Amino acid sequence: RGWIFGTTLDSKTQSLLIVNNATNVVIKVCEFQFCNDPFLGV
Amino acid sequence: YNYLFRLFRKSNLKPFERDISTEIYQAGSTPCNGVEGFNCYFPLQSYGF
Numbered sequence: 001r002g003w004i005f006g007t008t009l010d011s012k013t014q015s016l017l018i019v020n021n022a023t024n025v026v027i028k029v030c031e032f033q034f035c036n037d038p039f040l041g042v
Numbered sequence: 043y044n045y046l047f048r049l050f051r052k053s054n055l056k057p058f059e060r061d062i063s064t065e066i067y068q069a070g071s072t073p074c075n076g077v078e079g080f081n082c083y084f085p086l087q088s089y090g091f
């Protein structure tokens with residue numbers, strides 16, 4: 001359902017994130033905190 | 043001093059490349075250890091208009 005792209009993928013620098021959640025497609029590049037493995041915990 | 047520019051990098055930017063990275067630029071033999079020093083420079087500067 002999704003992808004991370006970038007150089008370091010560290011949740012610190014600029015890095016593309018793409019997620020499908022069935023209601024929407026959500027895209028971010030954020031210089032911001034995420035999980036080290038942000039799977040959808042259904 | 044609120045307006046800033048980059049002065050150094052590994053290589054010149056590609057068309058519309060938008061690199062924020064603030065890590066110490068290593069320009070030679072010595073490692074930078076997370077600080078400025080010999081061969082090791084902070085990549086941003088201010089105009090100070």
Ligand SMILES: *[C@@H]1O[C@H](CO)[C@@H](O)[C@H](O)[C@H]1NC(C)=O
Nearest residue numbers: 020021022023024025026027
């Ligand atoms: C999908 O993401 C949007 C925010 O972009 C959110 O409003 C929506 O509730 C999400 N859908 C689900 C099923 O969580």
